Amino acid sequence: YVNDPSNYQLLIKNLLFSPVAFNPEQEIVYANHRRHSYKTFHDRVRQFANALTKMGVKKGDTVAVMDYDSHRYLECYFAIPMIGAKLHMINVRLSPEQILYTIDHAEDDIILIHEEFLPILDQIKGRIDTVTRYVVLRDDEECEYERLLEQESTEYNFPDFDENTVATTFYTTGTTGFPKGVFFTHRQLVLHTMGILSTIGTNASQGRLHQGDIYMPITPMFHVHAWGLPYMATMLGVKQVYPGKYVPDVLLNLIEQEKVTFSHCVPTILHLLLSSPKSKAMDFSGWKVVIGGAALPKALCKSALERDIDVFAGYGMSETGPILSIVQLTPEQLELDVDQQAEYRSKTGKKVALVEAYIVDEDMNKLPHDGETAGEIVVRAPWLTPNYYKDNKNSKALWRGGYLHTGDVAHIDDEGFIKITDRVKDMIKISGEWVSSLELEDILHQHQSVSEVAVIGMPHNKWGEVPLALVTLKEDAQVTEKELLGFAKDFINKGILAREALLLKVKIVDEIAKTSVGKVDKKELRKLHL
Amino acid sequence: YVNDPSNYQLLIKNLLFSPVAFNPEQEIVYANHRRHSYKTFHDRVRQFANALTKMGVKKGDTVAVMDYDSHRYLECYFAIPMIGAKLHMINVRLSPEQILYTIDHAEDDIILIHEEFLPILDQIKGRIDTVTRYVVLRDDEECEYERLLEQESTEYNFPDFDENTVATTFYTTGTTGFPKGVFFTHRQLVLHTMGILSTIGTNASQGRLHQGDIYMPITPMFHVHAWGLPYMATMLGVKQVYPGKYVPDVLLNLIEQEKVTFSHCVPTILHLLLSSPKSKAMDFSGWKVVIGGAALPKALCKSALERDIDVFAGYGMSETGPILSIVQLTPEQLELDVDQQAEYRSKTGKKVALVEAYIVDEDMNKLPHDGETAGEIVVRAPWLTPNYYKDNKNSKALWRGGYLHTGDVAHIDDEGFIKITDRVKDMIKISGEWVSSLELEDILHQHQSVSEVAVIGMPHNKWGEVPLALVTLKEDAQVTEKELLGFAKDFINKGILAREALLLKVKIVDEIAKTSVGKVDKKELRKLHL
Amino acid sequence: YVNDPSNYQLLIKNLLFSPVAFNPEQEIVYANHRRHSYKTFHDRVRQFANALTKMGVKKGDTVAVMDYDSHRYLECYFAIPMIGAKLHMINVRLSPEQILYTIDHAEDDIILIHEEFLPILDQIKGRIDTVTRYVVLRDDEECEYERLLEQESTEYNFPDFDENTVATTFYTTGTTGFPKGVFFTHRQLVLHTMGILSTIGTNASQGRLHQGDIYMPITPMFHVHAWGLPYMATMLGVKQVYPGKYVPDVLLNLIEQEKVTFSHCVPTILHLLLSSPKSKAMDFSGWKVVIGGAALPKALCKSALERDIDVFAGYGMSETGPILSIVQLTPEQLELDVDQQAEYRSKTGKKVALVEAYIVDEDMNKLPHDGETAGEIVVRAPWLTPNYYKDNKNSKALWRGGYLHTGDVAHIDDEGFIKITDRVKDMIKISGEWVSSLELEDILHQHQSVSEVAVIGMPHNKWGEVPLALVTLKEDAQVTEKELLGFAKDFINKGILAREALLLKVKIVDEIAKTSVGKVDKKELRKLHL
C-alpha cells in the first residue's frame, strides 16, 4: 500500500497515538490484580504487536478472543486492528454449538482464551479446524499472554493502510436460524468515537463524559465493543478500571475505592447493585451509569434517582455501531421532580449526531412524528454494517428500501424523543391494526399473583393474528384464567373491539422457555403452542 | 450474454438435444408407477422450465431437491441447469441439523421435497429462512410437481450462456466439523460424460456401456450425480428404469421384468440382492453392476462372479467428478479363473482418460510405481471442484502443491493398477513408518468369534502412534484379549518390530459408534478412548 | 503463460500422455521398413521436441510437412503442436503453383519433405522465401530426420499453454480462385477425438472402434487429419500400421499379415482392392473400412458386402473437423438383406454427438425433415474453423446467418438419416425449382455406350438455367445425341415440364476436364462451353 501523506486515513492507531489528551502517569487498573500507567499500556501494545507478528499473523488474518473485561482485552482492542488483522469477539454466553459455528464461519487463525472458559472449548476442541494456536490467559503469573509479551521488544512501527480495511467482527443471534456476522472498519470506529464524544461531551451539566472521569465497563465488552466506550475513554486519557467477573460486592467495592464516575450496565446488574446490602451506606452521587441493554424500566430508574445517580438510557442494536440515540435533558427538564425525571430518562432518546432515524411502514411511507403513530425505525449513520458476512438474502432484507432496518417499532415525539414500543416480529396483526404485546405483558404483570407473562399471536380467519397470554404463578398462588381475563378487561383507553378484550386467552404454564442469554423464546413458543 | 456462433460453449442442453442417439419411442420407466417415451421426457423438461420461470427462478437462483430416484429427478438433472440456476442435491441420510446447515449455507430459493421426507423438514421448518416455496412430491395424482407442469406449455427456448456457470452442488461430510460444499460447471459435467463414455464405451468385450443397454441406478443419486450415469444414459438414448425405495424384492422384480443390463450399487445392496431367496432362481448373466461405494470385498466379488455377473469396481470421492478410475480387464485376463478374477475386479483400477493420478509423500516426492510403496493419491482431471464453497483454508489444503488431495493412501502397480490401502488420517505413525489399519481390521475380523473391529492410534513417546483394537463379540462368545493378541501374533510377513506385535492392545466393547450414513466413527473414538 | 492448476486446458499432450489405454509393448509399424513399441514412440516424440527447440522453433512458428503416411507423420501430428508451433499440412496432389502459394501464405519456417517429393520443390525452390531449413526424409538409414533425432535426448518437459492456441492448418481448394486456409486449436482437436470416440465407440455390434482393433490409414493423411483417426487410435493404444505409397498389393499383403481390422479409404482405392486378383482368396470378414471421400456408390457397397466387409460411409468436408455424420445401423437393420443393406450404408448418415445439422433455404427458413425437401446443410459443432486464414469476405459467407455453410444440398429423413443430393453451386435453376445434376449424370451413365457424363447449366430467359450434358463415348461406340435424349426421356417420375425433357441438350465430347485431384471441372466447362 502506497499513500501520499496529503491523503489522511482514519485509523485506530491515530485514535491511540493522537488522543484528545495523553497523561503518561494515568493508570489502567485490573481489579486488585494489576495496575500500570499509560506508558506501560503503550509499551504492552507494541509488545503484543511484535508477538503477533512473530506468530505469523498477517494483514488478512483473524484473531479470536474469549475472556472477561481486563487490560488484556483493551490491549486486544488496539493491537490486533493496528497490525491489520481482524478482531473477532466471541460471545461466551452462547451455546458451544453456536460458538463452534461462529469460529468455523469466521475462520479464526489464533484463539486467545481464558482459563475458566477452557471446559467450553474442551467439548468442541476436535470439531475446530483452521486454528493453529491457543493462548491461555490467567490472572496470575502463569499467563501465556504475559509470557509471550515479555519475550518481545517495546519498539514497533505500525503500518498505514486504507481506512476501509475491516477491524472488528462479532456475531449476533437475532431472529435467524444461525448467528449473523457484522463487521466494521477503522474509519467507522474512529467516526463513531468522534461522533459520540461530540454528542455527549458537549452537554451542559447532565450525563456528559469529560476528561476528568473514571471509567468502568459493566457490559460484557464482547458484544457491541462495550458501546465503544473503551475507545472513547482511551482517547480522553482517563483512568480505566476493569472488574472482571462482575460480582456485585466486588463492583461496589471498586466503585467505592477507585472512585468510579462513569459506567454502562444493564437493568439486571443495576438492580442487583442497588438491592445489595453493602450499597445501603455507600455514596452514589458522582456516578453516571448508562443503561443500554434493553428497556430501562421506570421503577428501576426512579429507585436509582432516589440515590442521586445520573442514570440515563441509550439505544443500540449490534449492527449500528451500536449507539444511535441517547437521552439528554435540557436545563428546564432538570427541575422536574422524580416522577417526570423517570419518564424522560427511560425513553429511547434523541438521535445522536449524524443519524437520520426515520419511522416508516412496509410501504416506506415515512409516518409523521405526531407522538402516537408507531412504525419501524430505519436509520442512516456513518457506522452501520454494510451487510452480513457471507450472506446475501439476509443482507438485502437488512438494507431494504435504502435504509437499515432495526426491527424495532417505535413512535417519535415532535421534539425528537423516541419511545420504542415493541419488535416488528412481535407485532400481532388483529384486523388491520398492530397492537404491541409489551404493554399487554406489562398490564398482566401488574397482577399480584403473576410472576412472568409472555404474549404471542395465533391465527384466526376473520381477525388475523389474535393474542394469547402465557403466565407463571407465584408461590402458593392459584388464580383461574377467568380472573386474569377480567383483570385485563378492567382497564380502559385502547382501540380495537371495545378495548380488544375478547381474545386475551390467558393460559397458566409452570415455566416459560428462555434463550441462553436470558430472553423469552417467543419463537419456540410460536412453535410449541401453535 | 452475447456470443458469436463460432465460439462453442459446452452446455448440458447440448447434452440433451444433441445426443449420441435419440429414439423418440424409447421409454423412461418409474417403477410400476409411470412410463413415458423420450418425446414426453423432452416435453416435460420444457414444461418444468416454464414452471420454474413462472415461479421467479432466475439465472443465479438455487433449487433444492429431496426425494428418491425417479423421473422427476432426472428431469431436475436437466431443467434446472439449463435455465441457468443451481441444482442443490440434499443428502437425505444426514441428520436434520446438518441438512438445515446445508440449506442455510447454499441459500436455497425453492425446495422440492418428497412427501415421506416431510417429517424431517417438520422439525427444522421454522429455522429455515430465504426459502419462498415448497413443492411436495407424491407417487399418485396428488403430486404438486405434476400439477405445476400441467399448467404449462411444452414450448421453451433455452438460453445460451458461458460454459463456466455453476450447474450442480452438493455437500460432503468428510473429516471436517461442518459439511463442505462442492460445485461443478456445465463444461465439467459435459467433459465428464464425454471422457467416461470414451473410456468405458471402447472396451472390447467386458464392462462396456453401449447403446443397447438398459440402465438402473441403485446409488442414491443425490450423492455424486449418481456417478454421472443419468447424464451418460440420456446421451445414449437408452431405456432408463427408476426403482425408488431400493427394496431388494422390488429391485429383483424390476431387473427380471424390465431386463436391466447396467447398474451401479454399493457392496451392502449387492450382498442383499445376492442373498435374497427370490434371486436364487433368476437369470443374472446379462447384468453389469458397477461397485463404487467403498472397497468391494473379494468374497462378495467371487460370489457375484459365480452367478455370471460382470461385476467391477470404480473409484470416486465426491470432489472429483466423481469418476477417476475403473477396472478394465484385458483379453488375456478374461481367461483366468474366479480366484484371479476377483483379485483384479476388486482393485481400484486404472485411471480413466484425461487423469494423471500420481502417488506422493508430504514432500510431494512422487514415489515410484513399484507395487508396494504406498502414498497419497493426487490427481489432475478436467472435472475437479476448484475449491470448497465459501471456504478458504480448507480449499488451500485441498489443492496443496498444485494437485487435488484425495486423502486416500494407495500403491500403484507397474502396469497401472491402483490398490487403495487406507486413508491418510487413518494412517498410524509407528516410529518412522506408516502401516494401514484396514489390514489389521481384516486380520482381526478373521476370528471366528469376532463381529466387528476398529483399529485406532494412541500416542507413545518413543514409538509415535501405536495401535489399539476395539472388537465386538458375537452371540454367546467370550474370548479374552490375550487370545486375540495371540491370534494376531500368529500371522507373519510384515515389517516393524518382529511383525509389529507388542502393541495391538485389543479391547472388547459392546458396540462401536457409527455415522448417520453407516461408517465407523474413528474420530469420535479418538476422542472417547483417548 | 501463468495457469492455476485448478483450471484445466484441453491440450494434445493430455491426449498423448493421458490416454484411454496405454500399452508399452504395443507397436507402431511402418510397412516392412520399421517397427517400434509405444515406449519408443514416446521417446521419439520427446527427441523430436528437443530437435525442434534446437532449430529455433518457437511457440508461434510454423512447420510444414510433405510426405506419405508413416511413423514420422504420426510423430509430427504430436510433437509440433505440443511445443506450441503450427503444423501445416501440404497437399502433395496440388500443382506446384498452388503449393508455392500455400507455403508463401502460411509463412512456413521449416519444411520437412520426402525425398521423392524433391522434384516438385526443385521448380519452386527459388520462388520460396521465409524458409530457413529443409529436412529431407528417406526410407533408409540416410534420413535427415533420423539423424536429427539421434543427436537428442529422450527427456523433455512439455509446456502448458492456453487451449485456444492454433495447432494445425491446411488448405482447401473449393470453389474459390485461391486455396483457403483452415485452422484448428488444441481444444477443438481434443473435443473431436472425445466426441467421435463417444459416438462410434458405443455402438452395439456394428461399425465400432474399440481397444482391440488394428488401425491402418488409406486416406492421404495430409487432408483432414486423416479424419482424426491417428489421434483416436493413439488414445486407444492400439496397433497402428502405415503403408506409405498405397500400392494395392502391398496394402492387401499388409492387411493379410498385420491383421488389420479398421481402416478409412475412398471409393476408388476400395474398388482397386476388391478387384485385385490377389484379394480373390483372402479373408475379409474382420475389416471395418470407412468410406469418406465422396458418394460411396451402392454397387461398390454391395460388392464389398458380399465379401463380408463392414463397410459404411461418413461425411466431412475439410472445414468441419471433419467428421459431422456417420451411418450407424440399429439391431433390426442388421437383419435386412444386402439390397437394403447397401441402401442404408451408402447414405450420409445421422449426425454425430454435439452436432446440430439443420437444412435451410437462402432465407434461412429451416425446411422440414419430410424426406424429399432438399436444402443446404448448415451445422454447429465444437470443432468448426471460425473463419478462413487471412480472409474477410469469404469468412463472412462461410458463417452467414449464424451457421457454417457446407455447400451441400441434401434432404433429411424423419428418423435422422441424411442423403446428400448435390452441391449448392451445381444446382441449376429451372423456372422456380432446383433439380440436381447428379441424378441426371447417373441416369445418362446407365447407357451401355457412355463412359462419363457431366451436366451443367446454361442461361435461358424464360426458364432460368437449363441443363446441358457432355458425354464421353466408349471404344468404337457412336450414338447420336438424339438417342441419348430419347433414352433420358424414357424414364419417368420427376417434376417440371412433363419430366423436364425438352432441354437435356446432350453433347458428345472426346474428353472432359478434371482437377489435379481428379474431380470434374464443372466451372471451367461453365467457361469453355458458355
Please report the DSSP string for A291-313 in residue order: E-SS---HHHHHHHHTTT---EE
Cell numbers that stand for B18 in this block: 444433441
The whole-angstrom distance between residue C7's C-alpha and the CA centroid of its chain comes to 34
DSSP-assigned letter for residue C196: H
The whole-angstrom distance between residue B493's C-alpha and the CA centroid of its chain comes to 34
Please report the DSSP string for B174-193 in residue order: TTSSS-EEEEEEHHHHHHHH
Residue B406 to chain A, least CA–CA distance (Å)? 18
Between chain B and chain C, are at least 3 CB pairs below 8 A? yes
> What's the rounded Cα separation, in Å, for the pair A418 and A431?
26
DSSP-assigned letter for residue B240: E
The three-state secondary structure class of C115 is helix
The three-state secondary structure class of A228 is helix
Pairing mode, if any, of strands C375-379 and C358-360? antiparallel
C-alpha dihedral (A73, A78, A83, A89), degrees to nearest 10 = 50
User: CB distance A176–B126 less than 8 Å?
Assistant: no
Cell numbers that stand for B138 in this block: 407424491
Cell numbers that stand for A357 in this block: 432515524
Give ∠ CA A183-A419-A288 in degrees, rounded to 5. Answer: 70
Residue C395, C-beta contacts closer than 8 angstroms, at least 6 positions apart: C386, C387, C388
> What's the rounded Cα separation, in Å, for the pair C214 and C197?
15
Residue B304 to chain C, least CA–CA distance (Å)? 25
Peptide bond into C119 cis (omega under 30): no
Is the distance from CB of A288 to CB of A315 less than 8 angstroms?
no
Is the distance from CB of C431 to CB of C496 less than 8 angstroms?
yes
For C204, the closest of B198, B211, B350 (CB atoms) is B211
User: CB distance B353–C235 less than 8 Å?
Assistant: yes
Cell numbers that stand for A493 in this block: 383507553
How many CB atoms sit inside 10 A of residue B512's CB?
Answer: 17
The three-state secondary structure class of A281 is helix
> What's the rounded Cα separation, in Å, for the pair A62 and A87?
6
Residues of B in contact with A393 (CB under 8 A): 107, 129-130
Residue type, B64: A
Residues of B in contact with A390 (CB under 8 A): 390
Residue B450, C-beta contacts closer than 8 angstroms, at least 6 positions apart: B444, B471, B472, B473, B474, B479, B484
Residue among C81, C67, C58 nearest C112 (CA): C67
Residue in B with minimal Cα distance to A390: B390
What are residue A436's DSSP bridge partners? none
Residue among A421, A397, A480 nearest A175 (CA): A397
Backbone φ/ψ region at C366: left (φ over 0), alpha (ψ -120 to 50), beta: left
Q: Which residue has the cell 420504542?
A: A420
Cell numbers that stand for B21 in this block: 442417439
- Whole-angstrom CA distances from C193 to B353, B488, C185, C235, C321 are 12, 53, 13, 9, 10
The three-state secondary structure class of A433 is strand
Catalytic residue among A227, A287, A383, A434: A434
The whole-angstrom distance between residue B390's C-alpha and the CA centroid of its chain comes to 23
Burial code (b: 16+ CB inside 10 Å, e: under 16) for C221-241 equals bbbbbbbbbbbbbbbbbbbbb
Peptide bond into A322 cis (omega under 30): yes
> What's the rounded Cα separation, in Å, for the pair C317 and B521?
61
Residue in A with minimal Cα distance to B396: A130
Is the distance from CB of A189 to CB of A12 less than 8 angstroms?
yes
Neighbours of chain C (3+ CB pairs under 8 A): B
φ, ψ of residue C478 in degrees (nearest 5): -140, 100
Residue in A with minimal Cα distance to B102: A178
C-alpha dihedral (A331, A334, A336, A340), degrees to nearest 10 = 110
The three-state secondary structure class of A147 is helix
Please report the DSSP string for C69-114 in residue order: SSHHHHHHHHHHHHTT-EEEEP-TTS-HHHHHHHHHHHT-SEEEEE
Residue type, C222: F
Query: Using CA of residue A304, residue A305, residue A310, residue A314, what is the dihedral sign?
Result: positive
Residue B385 to chain A, least CA–CA distance (Å)? 20
- Whole-angstrom CA distances from C46 to C64, C149, C150, C473 are 19, 9, 11, 57
Residue C257, C-beta contacts closer than 8 angstroms, at least 6 positions apart: none
- Whole-angstrom CA distances from A203 to A19, A21, A252, B143 are 20, 19, 27, 68
User: CB distance B176–A107 less than 8 Å?
Assistant: no
Residue pairs between chains B and C whose CB atoms are closer than 8 Å: 104
User: CB distance A176–B390 less than 8 Å?
Assistant: no
To the nearest 10 degrees (0 to 180), the angle between helices B481-489 and B437-445 is: 110
Residue among C254, C227, C229 nearest C242 (CA): C254
Residue in B with minimal Cα distance to C236: B202
Report the residue of B4, B16, B18, B384 to disrupt the C interface, i.e. the one with the largest count of C CBs within 10 Å. B18
Neighbours of chain B (3+ CB pairs under 8 A): A, C
For B130, the closest of A127, A128, A393 (CB atoms) is A393
User: CB distance C5–B355 less than 8 Å?
Assistant: no
A174 among annotated binding-site residues:
yes
For C194, the closest of B198, B387, B402 (CB atoms) is B198
Binding site listing of C for ATP: 174, 293, 314, 318, 408, 423
Residue C322, Cβ density class (10 Å: 0-12 exposed, 13-18 middle, ≥19 buried): buried
Q: Kindly provide the residue ranges of all beta strands, DSSP E only, lying in A75-233, ordered along the sequence.
A: 86-89, 110-114, 133-137, 166-172, 180-185, 214-217
Catalytic residue flag (residue A399): no
- Whole-angstrom CA distances from B260 to A27, C113, C191 are 84, 56, 31
For B176, the closest of A101, A129, A178 (CB atoms) is A129
Residue type, A272: L
> What's the rounded Cα separation, in Å, for the pair A29 and A35?
4
Give catalytic residues of B, as residue numbers: 172, 319, 429, 434
Q: Which helix (H) or strand (E) holds B152?
A: none
Cell numbers that stand for B480 in this block: 479374552
Residue among B19, B12, B30 nearest B80 (CA): B12
Residue among A219, A201, A226 nearest A77 (CA): A226
> What's the rounded Cα separation, in Å, for the pair B388 and B183?
8
Residue pairs between chains A and B whose CB atoms are closer than 8 Å: 37
Neighbours of chain A (3+ CB pairs under 8 A): B
- Whole-angstrom CA distances from A395 to A182, A380, C203 are 10, 15, 53
φ, ψ of residue B221 in degrees (nearest 5): 75, -10
Residue in A with minimal Cα distance to B107: A393
φ, ψ of residue A232 in degrees (nearest 5): -70, -50
For B393, the closest of A107, A126, A527 (CB atoms) is A107
φ, ψ of residue C301 in degrees (nearest 5): -65, -40
> What's the rounded Cα separation, in Å, for the pair A174 and A404?
15
Between chain C and chain A, are at least 3 CB pairs below 8 A? no
Query: What is the C-alpha radius of gyration for chain B, rounded to an integer number of angstroms?
Result: 24
How many CB atoms sit inside 10 A of residue B33's CB?
Answer: 12
Report the residue of B127, B128, B456, B523 to disrupt the A interface, i.e. the one with the largest count of A CBs within 10 Å. B127
Is the distance from CB of B311 to CB of B345 less than 8 angstroms?
yes
Residue A202, Cβ density class (10 Å: 0-12 exposed, 13-18 middle, ≥19 buried): exposed
Residue in B with minimal Cα distance to C403: B5
The three-state secondary structure class of C7 is coil
Q: How many CA atoms lie within 13 A of A9 on its CB side?
A: 18
Residue B128, Cβ density class (10 Å: 0-12 exposed, 13-18 middle, ≥19 buried): middle
> What's the rounded Cα separation, in Å, for the pair C421 and A517?
83
What are residue C435's DSSP bridge partners? C428
Cell numbers that stand for A373 in this block: 403513530
> What's the rounded Cα separation, in Å, for the pair B88 and B108?
8
Please report the DSSP string for C229-276 in residue order: HHHHHHHHT-EEEE-SS--HHHHHHHHHHHT--EEEE-HHHHHHHHHS
Which method, experimentally, gave rise to this model? cryo-EM
Residue in A with minimal Cα distance to B109: A393
Q: In what order do the strands lie in the sheet with A110-114?
A: A133-137, A110-114, A62-66, A86-89, A166-172, A180-185
Q: Which residue has the cell 459435459?
A: B190
Residue C401 to chain B, least CA–CA distance (Å)? 9
Give catalytic residues of C, as residue numbers: 172, 319, 429, 434
Report the residue of B61, B100, B129, B392 to disrupt the A interface, i.e. the one with the largest count of A CBs within 10 Å. B129
For B204, the closest of C6, C18, C211 (CB atoms) is C211
For B129, the closest of A100, A176, A527 (CB atoms) is A176
User: CB distance A130–B523 less than 8 Å?
Assistant: no
- Whole-angstrom CA distances from B207 to A194, B291, B330, B345 are 75, 12, 11, 11
Q: How many CA atoms lie within 13 A of A306 on its CB side?
A: 9
> What's the rounded Cα separation, in Å, for the pair C521 and C79?
38
> What's the rounded Cα separation, in Å, for the pair A6 and B446?
79
Binding site listing of B for Mg(2+): 317-319
Is the distance from CB of A359 to CB of A376 less than 8 angstroms?
yes
> What's the rounded Cα separation, in Å, for the pair A189 and A14?
11
